[PDB]
Design a protein around this nucleic acid. Structure first.
Ligand code: AGS
Ligand code: AGS
Ligand code: AGS
Ligand code: MG
Ligand code: MG
Ligand code: MG
Lengths: 438, 494, 118, 435
DNA sequence: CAAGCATAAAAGATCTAAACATAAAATCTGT
DNA sequence: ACAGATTTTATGTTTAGATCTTTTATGCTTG
């Protein structure tokens, strides 16, 4: 049937947010923030008044989405009065930011109706001369993503220029800095802080479960005539969101208490609404929410217990022996030889208790040890996993770690999982559960 | 051809000459009248600023609406007779005038806290002195503003000066030697005085310690007719950077700027609103357009006590003029937002402000959000913070191993097995509600909540590969976390 | 480290191939991928590790695993020569078990020395 | 939407989700996606099966293992995207951009924008999947690189006809959690059970094992002219099951290592096949029992060329490392008790050169003098150090002469022990106190 | 003897200066 | 005197060498 296919496509498009503007679903808890951002951007573009603002909030807190929605709404009517220049604090470095600003200036100027040519200092002086300096002036709306990287510890050359530019220049200027840190104002130096408009609007948060369930209803209730099923499906969802005991409401409560992030629930719903092949399957799956449980099991199926249940017998024996040695040691450190000695003592004790277990040799337990440290069950003595940035990673790459040169037997490790948790996980019926405690 | 060991194809070199000014003329006696040459000084090349000006101009407009508070917001910005800096104005103006009518080179080093009028007052001094020179009272001069922090590299500021006094384009080394030879060997007969405003000297010095020495030494030469007005934040920048001997052998007038008092800031704000305070405006209810002297006459005034309290609050902490201007503008914006909230005027009988609006703006500026950010976090976030606080109280090391956090969370959630929330939160917190999911060693949202806290700048985790023993500290003060947990309804019960 | 091993190896490969054969290509393993297209010939790279005892075996093992990725092309053949000085016991001890398994498919213990055989 | 889900062996849910996310419509396809799972979990296999079961949607395959740093990664991204776009639509007139012109992520943004604008004559919205297969396997990895690729899609034009969607592939599940708050949709790939891995090995290897030339040669040599393909499939499956049941506890669930063991052990197993053996499954197990008990994955088919003086120097160095100095005089009086903690399991201690020389003189047998330390002793010691056998306690730029450098033996117990029996000098005699 | 107490030195984070490297604009050299 | 040869300013890319800081392997020391 084509009707269910069209309904599925429309519903999943609604879920992903790619629905055309002027009908995009907006939640009821960020409507105030949307009105505030709309107020700022309209007061700046319509009235050609320049000002700055920094958005703050966690990841996926609807700030890039909200700004993009505002720009799309305001672009369908007033397109010749503003040019959008967006920088991202991650990919745009300090030197490349000037090049990016110049390139986007020239591109938007060409689109509405050179700068980027020359050295970087020539580029900077050119953009400064252009922009810092009846008809109106095309306002340049800047959008900084992750402004905390440009905030920096020392230099702050770009932020000072842009805030003095919005404070003193003639052409109207916006700058929206979408950063994450709550103490963003502590990042900016004294001069940049003085230049900054001292206006920060904090992203709204889900304060009540009713807010999340209303947002889910707004997100998943198609409100247009596309397929013959739209009249049916909607009321079904209403029922599923009317009874508190209903499974979907229970999962919403779970997400609210654990994650409290609507994008996680949306990423869970999308495969649920894409797997169904007919309307009956979709209705029974939204009533049962079995696929939500399958998705939750799969997400957790590889972290530390989904890993732990994939261990073979010898691998589990070596893991338990290493945990024993780590717990017996004062600092928790151990090495290959101590773990193997404890393992062989354990196997000898089990065999003397006695069918027969093959005590694997050293050269056959070496492979199990390598597999076990490869699955990130062990770590090196004092090893930092990933460096903060590229410079530190390069410095580490040039250096030669001492643990590399030490022979394989004597490398001192440390344990991800303590022995008590190992006892907590391993089933009672297993044949190594006797040695899981001292 | 050769095989390149590495390629850089994005290199872009400007067209800048290399030969300094020393070798340009081949003879000191052959130096012409540098005052009257086609390219030297401000005698050509004004077309570039006119080229980019028309780039951003549009040809479309549609009945803009200027509300009653738009005038206040436009007149209260930092873009625009300074009464509160008259003493320093007079001092620096006297120094510059004495140095300019006597054909002598001097240096004025002025320093102070950000946003106290230093750049504004020096620019006003230069404008007034240029106006006096227009009356043919002192030899003519050119003003070259060299902002340190508006430059890609610190050594750029040399060539700019040359490019602004010689019309040529030279690299930084050639510019150094050219400026030195122009300030040392060119006779005073064939030179025009130069005033240089080394704005933000703090960024120029850095590791180099070269810009500041060159600029404070070029004023020592008798041939050079240069009045260097350096401005900075730290008062002790010269004596520290150059050394006592050099800062003594160079005699430069030092000026220090003090942050405005509450009376001075109130005077600044009142002077900036002399033309709008207690004014009559004609406003039409159809659109809301306000015209200064269905049409209604509305009186606009800004409450004196609101300005007084705003100035008192902003001066007691920093005294910066810009912060006072911005907070007053924000209060006016709040009043205007309320105005269109009540009316609904959109875009395309006495209206005033109140101390409540100014207080709201000041509270928004001052009060933090961490105490409010915690209280709206998920249950697992508050549980993590509670376990961190408990372990910090027990150990006292104000940092905890992460696996120890996990153990404390497990113990805390298993001891309170009778608390009315716990028996139904444990299932959804360790198995995520459904069965077929084995007992999870960590919480369901452990990684999510940990990254949510680390990203929010509210918790610092050192980098280590072992997630069991990596330590986490609370960047926020411990009192905030305790208050936030006390604000919760179920955490305080257990 | 591994990245410099690869960059030096690819530079030597490019230089030798261009000298034999008489634009530029970035120094990465894809130069092996594009070799048949670039020069219209098959390739045989022979790696001579001069002092395999001195190199820290972590980076050598990582480089061998990286070279393992160059077998999806069906036009490139690789040959490794390990100038071991002590014995294969240290090689077995230091190298990962998976790397030893990969090497074992074709190895030839050759005893070359001035003191052997008298 | 209207995409076909391929039939994979044991990845039903994984392929269901993969078809749920990947689609030819860019409006309903996530801008990022992560197939997370460890080695041998079958993610490139199922991804390739999916992209071969839906040829209507276009993909570009990348291997970041071959592209060690981030700059080669960006250059390869640009080059492969340009080449794929040229191959897909040869009729579009397009100028080329040098892939080596990109050196920062901003340059990649600009080059992708310039390539995508010149393809604006496409009739319908097109999504191009760029599979960074092995992103976590980068050798120049750092925490602040993945999020560049995460936020890359924001910097590209919204209304462009060609949209690039990323499909990453990582294998650590601790690198992924670092970005767990990005809420990017991901498909976690669990490991394989013993029965699952046995079935996968059977399915992927019975054809190759049956079509072995060695088995055909053995059959034609041994003259068994009554066989069917079913018999060969049964014997291959029996061998696979036997090797799995014999070495699963040793190899875990890694398919690669089991494949290596099968390849290693098949020639001997087929060489031990005769007339009446093949028609009896237990005959091969009872006759080729040697193969299935002891694993063989080492270069030694189933010591040091040092001098005598170098061997004795190594033995003396190990004795110095693993003996308490305050017991040296009492033990070596050649002209409360010992600890039983077996210090041979711990890291070797740091001693001094003088103690090493003294104990070397003590343990060296009398020839023909006590072998007074000469040029040869010191040269042998330096040669031992440059072989990384006696490691010092300072970083590079080593000066052996400063009275602040200390030496420690750098061989385990096995090598030093078998060196001791190589020269027939007792080593479990001075350690008889510590057994 | 061990604990306590102290100083000391290994392991590595973090960084800089030097050797090695390429490249575009302007200068200096011969017909 | 016009194109080639050399230089000058301006980076990028690896190797060799430095000090700070944290942790922990050494001694000092009663019975
Ligand atoms: N182009 C887009 N159109 C519509 N919705 C989008 C778009 N991009 C992302 N979203 C949605 O925005 C939500 C995520 O929040 P975003 O605003 O995208 O991210 P964010 O809150 O800015 O986080 P950052 O970027 O990490 S600070 C999810 O609902 C996404 O599906
Ligand atoms: N005496 C004054 N009278 C009126 N307005 C003033 C006065 N002093 C400062 N202001 C206002 O405050 C602003 C201060 O700007 P500047 O003086 O350029 O800042 P600054 O003191 O140079 O600080 P920097 O640049 O950070 S060192 C002026 O632009 C006016 O808006
Ligand atoms: N579901 C499956 N059905 C059939 N064969 C499978 C399946 N899963 C894995 N395989 C086999 O596994 C091998 C391919 O492994 P990959 O899928 O490359 O593993 P991988 O985890 O992607 O490897 P990495 O992560 O790239 S090292 C081949 O022998 C496949 O036939
Ligand atoms: Mg963003
Ligand atoms: Mg200023
Ligand atoms: Mg693969």
């Amino acid at each position: 049937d084509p009707g269910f296919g069209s309904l599925q496509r429309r519903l999943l498009q609604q879920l992903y947010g790619t629905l055309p503007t002027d009908e995009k679903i907006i939640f009821t808890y960020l409507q105030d923030c949307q009105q505030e951002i709309d107020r700022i951007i309209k007061q700046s573009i319509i009235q050609k008044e320049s000002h700055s603002v920094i958005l703050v909030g966690p990841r996926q807190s609807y700030k890039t989405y909200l700004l993009d929605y505002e720009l799309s709404l305001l672009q369908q009517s007033y397109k010749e009065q503003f040019i959008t220049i967006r920088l991202n604090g991650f990919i745009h470095s300090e030197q490349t930011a000037i090049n990016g600003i110049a390139t986007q200036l020239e591109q938007q100027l060409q689109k509405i109706h050179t700068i980027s040519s020359g050295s970087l200092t020539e580029v900077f002086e050119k953009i400064l001369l252009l922009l810092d300096s009846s008809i109106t002036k095309i306002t340049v709306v800047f959008i900084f993503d992750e402004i905390d990287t440009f905030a920096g510890p020392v230099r702050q050359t770009l932020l000072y220029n842009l805030f003095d530019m919005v404070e003193h220049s003639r052409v109207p200027v916006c700058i929206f800095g979408c950063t994450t840190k709550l103490n963003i104002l502590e990042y900016l130096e004294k001069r940049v802080k003085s230049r900054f408009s001292q206006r920060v609007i904090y992203m709204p948060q889900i304060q009540n479960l009713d807010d999340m369930v209303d947002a889910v209803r707004n997100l998943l209730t198609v409100r247009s005539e596309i397929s013959p099923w739209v009249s049916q499906w909607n009321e079904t969802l209403e029922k599923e969101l009317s009874d508190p005991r209903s499974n979907l409401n229970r999962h919403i409560r779970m997400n609210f208490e654990t994650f409290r992030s609507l994008p996680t629930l949306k990423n869970s719903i999308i495969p649920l609404v894409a797997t169904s092949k007919n309307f009956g399957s979709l209705c029974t799956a939204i009533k049962s929410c079995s696929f939500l449980d399958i998705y939750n099991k799969n997400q957790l199926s590889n972290n530390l217990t989904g890993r732990l249940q994939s261990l073979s017998d010898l691998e589990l024996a070596i893991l338990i022996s290493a945990a024993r040695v780590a717990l017996r040691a004062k600092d928790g450190s151990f090495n290959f030889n101590l773990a193997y000695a404890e393992y062989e003592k354990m196997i000898k004790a089990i065999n003397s208790r006695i069918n027969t277990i093959k005590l694997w040799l050293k050269k056959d337990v070496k492979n199990v040890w390598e597999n076990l440290v490869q699955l990130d069950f062990f770590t090196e003595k004092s090893a930092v996993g990933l460096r903060d940035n590229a410079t530190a990673a390069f410095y580490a790459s040039n250096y030669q770690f001492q643990g590399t040169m030490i022979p394989f037997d004597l490398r001192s490790y440390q344990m991800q999982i303590i022995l008590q948790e190992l006892r907590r996980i391993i089933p009672k019926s297993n044949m190594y559960y006797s040695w899981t405690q001292l | 051809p050769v095989i390149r060991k590495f390629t850089k194809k994005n290199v872009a070199r400007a067209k800048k000459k290399y030969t300094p000014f020393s070798k340009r003329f081949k003879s000191i006696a052959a130096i012409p009248d540098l005052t009257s040459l086609p390219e030297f000084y401000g005698n050509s090349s004004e077309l570039m600023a006119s080229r980019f000006e028309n780039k951003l101009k549009t040809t479309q407009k549609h009945q803009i609406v200027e509300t009653i508070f738009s005038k206040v917001k436009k007149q209260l910005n930092s873009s625009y007779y300074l009464p509160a800096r008259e003493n320093e104005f007079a001092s620096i103006y006297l120094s510059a005038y004495s140095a300019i009518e006597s054909d002598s080179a001097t240096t004025i080093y002025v320093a102070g806290t950000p946003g106290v009028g230093k750049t504004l007052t020096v620019r006003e001094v230069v404008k007034e002195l240029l106006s006096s020179s227009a009356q043919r009272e002192i030899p003519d001069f050119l003003y070259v503003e060299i902002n340190g922090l508006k430059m890609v590299k610190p050594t750029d500021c040399y060539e700019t000066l040359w490019n602004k006094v010689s019309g040529e384009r030279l690299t930084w080394a050639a510019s150094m030697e050219s400026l030195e030879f122009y300030f040392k060997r060119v006779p005073k007969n064939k030179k025009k005085t130069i005033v240089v405003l080394l704005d933000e000297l703090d960024a120029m010095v850095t590791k180099s310690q070269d810009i500041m020495y060159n600029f404070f030494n070029w004023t020592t030469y008798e041939n050079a007719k240069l009045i260097v007005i350096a401005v900075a934040n730290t008062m002790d920048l010269p004596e520290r950077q150059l050394g006592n001997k050099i800062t003594s052998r160079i005699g430069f007038t030092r000026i220090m700027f003090t942050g405005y008092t509450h009376e001075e800031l109130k005077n600044i704000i009142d002077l900036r609103l002399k033309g709008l305070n207690d004014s009559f405006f004609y406003v039409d209810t159809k659109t809301g357009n306000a015209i200064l002297i269905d049409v209604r006459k509305v009186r606009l005034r800004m409450s004196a006590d609101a300005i007084e309290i705003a100035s008192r609050k902003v001066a007691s902490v920093s005294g910066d003029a810009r912060r006072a201007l911005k907070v007053c503008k924000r209060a006016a914006e709040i009043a205007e937002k309320h105005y269109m909230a009540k009316h609904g005027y959109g875009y395309d009988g006495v209206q005033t402000v109140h101390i409540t609006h100014v207080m709201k703006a000041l509270n928004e500026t001052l009060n933090s959000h961490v105490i409010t950010f915690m209280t709206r976090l998920s249950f697992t976030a508050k549980l993590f913070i509670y376990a961190l606080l408990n372990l910090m109280k027990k150990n006292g090391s104000q940092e905890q191993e992460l696996g120890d956090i996990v153990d404390e969370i497990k113990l805390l959630i298993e001891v309170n097995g009778s608390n009315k929330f716990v028996m139904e939160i444990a299932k959804t917190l360790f198995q995520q509600g459904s069965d077929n999911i084995s007992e999870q060693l960590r919480i369901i949202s452990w990684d999510f909540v940990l990254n949510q806290l680390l990203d929010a700048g509210i918790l610092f985790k050192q980098t280590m590969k072992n997630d069991r023993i990596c330590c986490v500290k609370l960047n926020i003060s411990v009192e905030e976390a305790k208050r936030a947990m006390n604000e919760d309804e179920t955490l305080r019960n257990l | 480290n591994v990245r410099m091993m690869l960059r030096r190896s690819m530079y030597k490969l490019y230089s030798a191939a261009d000298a034999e054969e008489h634009n530029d290509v970035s120094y990465d393993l894809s130069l092996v991928e594009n070799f048949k297209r670039l020069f219209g010939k098959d390739l045989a790279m022979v790696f001579n590790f001069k002092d395999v005892d001195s190199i820290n075996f972590n980076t050598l093992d990582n480089f061998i695993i990286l070279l393992k990725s160059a077998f999806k092309y069906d036009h490139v053949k690789i040959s490794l020569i390990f100038n071991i000085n002590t014995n294969l016991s240290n090689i077995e001890k230091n190298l990962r078990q998976s790397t030893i398994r990969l090497l074992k498919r074709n190895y030839h213990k050759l005893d070359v020395s001035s003191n052997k055989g008298f | 939407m209207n995409v076909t889900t391929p039939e994979v062996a044991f990845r039903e849910y994984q392929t269901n989700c993969l078809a749920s996310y990947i689609s030819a419509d860019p409006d309903i396809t996530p801008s990022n996606l992560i197939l997370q799972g460890y080695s041998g979990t079958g993610k490139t296999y199922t991804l390739k099966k999916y992209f071969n079961a839906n040829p209507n949607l276009h993909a570009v395959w990348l291997e970041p293992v071959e592209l060690v740093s981030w700059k080669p990664l960006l250059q390869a991204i640009a080059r492969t995207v340009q080449y794929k776009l040229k191959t897909l639509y040869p009729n579009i007139p397009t100028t080329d951009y040098d892939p080596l012109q990109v050196e920062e992520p901003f340059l990649l943004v600009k080059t992708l924008h310039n390539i995508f604008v010149q393809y604006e004559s496409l009739q319908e919205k097109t999504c191009l999947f760029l599979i960074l297969d092995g992103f976590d396997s980068l050798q120049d990895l750092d925490a602040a690189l993945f999020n560049k690729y995460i936020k890359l899609n924001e910097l590209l034009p919204k209304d462009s006809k060609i949209n690039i969607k990323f499909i990453y592939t990582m294998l650590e599940t601790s690198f992924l959690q670092r970005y767990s708050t990005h809420c990017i949709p991901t498909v976690m790939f669990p490991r394989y059970n013993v029965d699952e891995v046995s079935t996968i090995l059977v399915m992927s290897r019975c054809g190759e094992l049956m079509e072995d030339s060695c088995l055909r040669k053995r059959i034609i040599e041994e003259q068994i002219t009554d066989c069917t393909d079913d018999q060969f499939q049964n014997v291959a499956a029996n061998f696979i099951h036997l090797i799995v049941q014999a070495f699963h506890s040793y190899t875990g669930n890694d398919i690669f290592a089991l494949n290596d063991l099968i390849d290693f052990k098949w020639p001997k197993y087929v060489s031990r096949i005769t007339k009446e053996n093949i028609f009896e499954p237990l005959a091969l197990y009872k006759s080729a029992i040697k193969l299935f008990l002891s694993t063989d994955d080492n270069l030694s088919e189933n010591t040091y060329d040092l001098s005598i003086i170098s061997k004795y120097l190594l033995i003396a160095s190990y004795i110095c490392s693993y003996l308490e100095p305050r017991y040296d005089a009492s033990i070596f009086s050649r002209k409360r008790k010992k600890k039983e903690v077996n210090p041979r399991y711990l890291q070797p201690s740091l001693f001094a050169i003088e103690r090493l020389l003294a104990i070397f003189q003590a343990i060296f047998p009398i020839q023909g003098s006590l072998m007074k330390a000469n040029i040869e002793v010191f040269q042998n010691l330096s040669e031992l150090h440059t072989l990384k056998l006696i490691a010092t306690t300072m970083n590079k730029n080593i000066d052996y002469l400063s009275p602040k450098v200390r030496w420690k033996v750098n061989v385990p117990w096995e090598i030093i022990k078998e060196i001791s029996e190589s020269v027939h000098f007792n080593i479990s005699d001075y350690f008889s106190d510590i057994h």
